[PDB]
RNA sequence: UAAUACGUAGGGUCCGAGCGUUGUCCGGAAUUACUGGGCGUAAAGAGCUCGUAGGUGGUUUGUCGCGUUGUUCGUGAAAACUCACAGCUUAACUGUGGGCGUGCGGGCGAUACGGGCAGACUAGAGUACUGCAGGGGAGACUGGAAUUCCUGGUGUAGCGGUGGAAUGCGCAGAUAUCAGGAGGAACACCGGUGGCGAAGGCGGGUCUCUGGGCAGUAACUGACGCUGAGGAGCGAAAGCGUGGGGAGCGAACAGGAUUAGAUACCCUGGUAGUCCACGCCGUAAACGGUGGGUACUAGGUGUGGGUUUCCUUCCUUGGGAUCCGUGCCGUAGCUAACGCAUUAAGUACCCCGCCUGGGGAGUACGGCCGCAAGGCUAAAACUCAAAGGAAUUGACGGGGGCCCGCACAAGCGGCGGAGCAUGUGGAUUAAUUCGAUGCAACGCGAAGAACCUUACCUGGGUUUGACAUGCACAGGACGCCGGCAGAGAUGUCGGUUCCCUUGUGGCCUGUGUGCAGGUGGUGCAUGGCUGUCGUCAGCUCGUGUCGUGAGAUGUUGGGUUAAGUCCCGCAACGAGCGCAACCCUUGUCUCAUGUUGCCAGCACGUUAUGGUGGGGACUCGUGAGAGACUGCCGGGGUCAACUCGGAGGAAGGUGGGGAUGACGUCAAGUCAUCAUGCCCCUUAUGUCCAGGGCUUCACACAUGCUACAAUGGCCGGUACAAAGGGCUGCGAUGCCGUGAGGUGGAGCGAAUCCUUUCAAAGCCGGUCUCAGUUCGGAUCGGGGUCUGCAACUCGACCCCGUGAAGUCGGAGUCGCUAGUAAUCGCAGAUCAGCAACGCU
């Protein structure tokens, strides 16, 4: 909020121009990093997990509470401890287009039937 | 010579002189007048702590100023102790003592007063842990304390050792030249021996 | 010397007619582990197998009731222990009545389990049949290269050896080279996380004799199996005995060589021994540091052996599936962790070995075996309070990878050589005041030691004092100006004898009471201040995840940097104190700013000249702001940073130098700048006094300068810098003195005036003409100046005469990358005048 409201307020060349370059870098890094705690505030609900094989290191971070961890399974990983798997296919763009609209469908209809 | 005084180093720019005058032949004279002044002051009154002492000289007037948050302890209420002060100052012969006494605004962001209060707490019978911790808390809850560093040293708690352990919080960039800094070095008695205390208080920047 | 841990004070806790100590036994001690432990590395798996006694044992039918199990009688003396009672003033103690008295003998009931008996079965086991490999062993015979050596040919003067050399082999004909011959060990490539064997261990080839192993059928017998105290047998290399043989290598041994000395690594020679036969010993890191045997217990992965369906060409790491053997990765699980993880260190039973703190000691004595060497079994006294295993942080490394600093290299001038200028060491000493101690001290605390300072010594006075303050008692004057005794301290006359306003005071005379003071000690009691590694780039925190924990992570890995500065991918996300930068000075420009300084354009003085009006134009002194920001170019570059050459500029790639010391160590230094906790002096380690010292020197160490000359010595003539200092002081011109110096004071709190209108190198003319010299100046004898009351220890300065060492410096070292180094001189804080040639 501070960073964005600074660049919104618009006070730049009262400081260093290279510092303006660096503030844009700050917002660029903070944008590749941060989308959702802008809106969260709600002690999140522990659910959708991704890329177990490559980042097994997330097993320690998320499961700790056991409130459901949930994904489309990975083909050959440390399987059944955690509450909610879903089989399927990992690879293909087309398959992903299909699953993407499927979540679009389920999420929008769950919103509507709220 | 590990860290010179930020007051003495920013003196040219950001902090300001404590005795303003001009003299050519009377310089030596005015300084010896001034030190005898401040010594008799501190030797007379010690129960409530002086925050600042400033002096100025003119053709015939003399303007001595004393900041302290607790005036009623320091001053003559009826005029007793303040007239005693004028008496000492007339023995030393300032000859026109417009003694403007003042109380400060923020006793907990006044570095010297805070160090003196903690030093008194130590010198009575007390430990240093709770005093240091509560000092940090009391300073940092107020608005302008952006960073502090409170540095207590001595035979702390009677441990027969030259010790040095400090508690800080916030931002204390002493190299930030433009920013106002307040320094206080105060040495306090104790049953075992003497303790030293230093405190740095950072305050914003200055634009100008 | 400052103890809650010693002795005593008070005090408090515990117990109580007892309280503590001693001695032994049990427990704690899961520390002999039947209940209830272990063997990969902590102590612990025999060197490996065969196997006697023994222990243990697949499936099923039937049977005995031996074990075992159930009840009953018999028994378990009494006293004990415990439950319920009664009583001894209760209790202690006593008795009553039970339970146990844990086991034993007889009968009876049960037969699941163990066992015995009579069988049977085929999954275990062995065998059989057919294939399959393989350095498995033993013997006989045999092969080629290669090394050395004896014959001869060509042949010449070295060859060999190392980090470098010499002993040595040769110069009588070596080495080298070539043909032949003699010889006795080891078999390059095949050959390797690769096969065989129980293990050690096994590879030139052919033959012969023999052994185990795997697979397929599973025809055959029907639990025969597993282990194994003892015991027997096998068993690397070295060593022993008898004989032969001996090329190479090679302990011992000899010589050369490095070395403080090298009985050692290096070199040159070389004996046993290594080799074969036959008898020995019986040890090893004989290590997978994991005893054997059987089964269950995710997979993936190479690789070896034999079977076999599928795509089948059906010739193939084809692929699939099973059996055996082998190496890597990996869950569960286990572990102190390291790590093992279907070839288990986990899962359970069978058998065995073995351990119970280290050291003494696997030693002694006794015995067995041994030709000997010596192996096996195997203690104790006594002593230590631990020895030890695994992993972490730090440091270190004559381990490594990547980097920077005048760290070396390059180029210059020095030290060490002589003279003296100062600062220390050691020894003198009545006193030579104290501290500082490689880097980070020694031109240090000093920035000016004759008295003073000064803290030290001889001699003298002082003692609530050299100066104060709190009390009261006795005071109203106290000092100051001159005199005398006096080295001075100090005691003594002449002149000063108050203003308050009746209560007392400024004040000082005493009396002592509180005392006042210390340069007396602890800088390892403390604070404060400061140097140092180091202006080197790092050092930490939050919250988290990992780890039983110390702790890790972030802060690892690439690009990249002056640097934890930055970018990129990741159990880290974020941040601070740091590095950068807003500070000063210098480097450029626009405007103003006009004297106490410039003075181009102008008019006026002319002996000294901006000297005077006049222009603020250039200078300019003082202030404010733009100018460097890889700013833009195009080729490179995770396209990111990071660079490469440009324009423009006064400066361009952190303009330059400055200021600035991350957390802390060196218990760094200063109780003598100062502050101060504790100990001591007090009739004195305080204190007032004059004299003397801190400058003693047969020497040592260190810092610097002045020199060893012609780029130089000497006279004379000519022009320029920056820069500051100043009042009870800087001192101008004139004149006199040789010259330091001098009455005197112009002008001056000072962009003016003293500061020659400010210099020395340098330039022009000439001499000296390479040598103890016109170099060099010590050192002394005298003639003198200034300041200070006072120049002997002890001051600086001019003049006369004086004329010493020194003819370019040793092993190594020091400082320097640009306006730097080397050289010339100036100015000054401190300071009356000085060693100041230091310091800035």
Short mmCIF file of C-alpha atoms (C1' of nucleotides) in Angstrom, two decimals, chain B residues 1-3 149 151-152 162-167 200, chain C residues 531-534 536 539 661-666 668:
data_model
loop_
_atom_site.label_atom_id
_atom_site.label_comp_id
_atom_site.label_asym_id
_atom_site.label_seq_id
_atom_site.Cartn_x
_atom_site.Cartn_y
_atom_site.Cartn_z
CA UNK B 1 37.54 6.81 19.39
CA UNK B 2 35.22 4.14 18.15
CA UNK B 3 32.26 6.50 17.71
CA UNK B 149 19.86 2.82 21.12
CA UNK B 151 23.69 1.50 25.97
CA UNK B 152 24.34 0.66 29.62
CA UNK B 162 33.73 -4.58 32.70
CA UNK B 163 30.55 -5.35 30.76
CA UNK B 164 28.75 -3.75 27.84
CA UNK B 165 25.27 -4.78 26.74
CA UNK B 166 22.70 -2.58 25.04
CA UNK B 167 19.09 -2.64 23.90
CA UNK B 200 21.18 7.81 20.80
"C1'" G C 531 45.07 3.09 19.31
"C1'" U C 532 44.70 -1.62 17.04
"C1'" C C 533 43.30 -5.78 13.54
"C1'" G C 534 40.68 -2.23 9.86
"C1'" C C 536 39.05 -4.74 5.49
"C1'" C C 539 28.56 -8.63 11.49
"C1'" G C 661 36.29 3.33 12.97
"C1'" A C 662 30.17 -2.42 11.35
"C1'" C C 663 30.23 -6.09 16.49
"C1'" G C 664 34.30 -6.92 19.29
"C1'" U C 665 39.39 -8.99 20.62
"C1'" C C 666 44.37 -7.94 22.13
"C1'" A C 668 45.60 -2.94 24.66
#
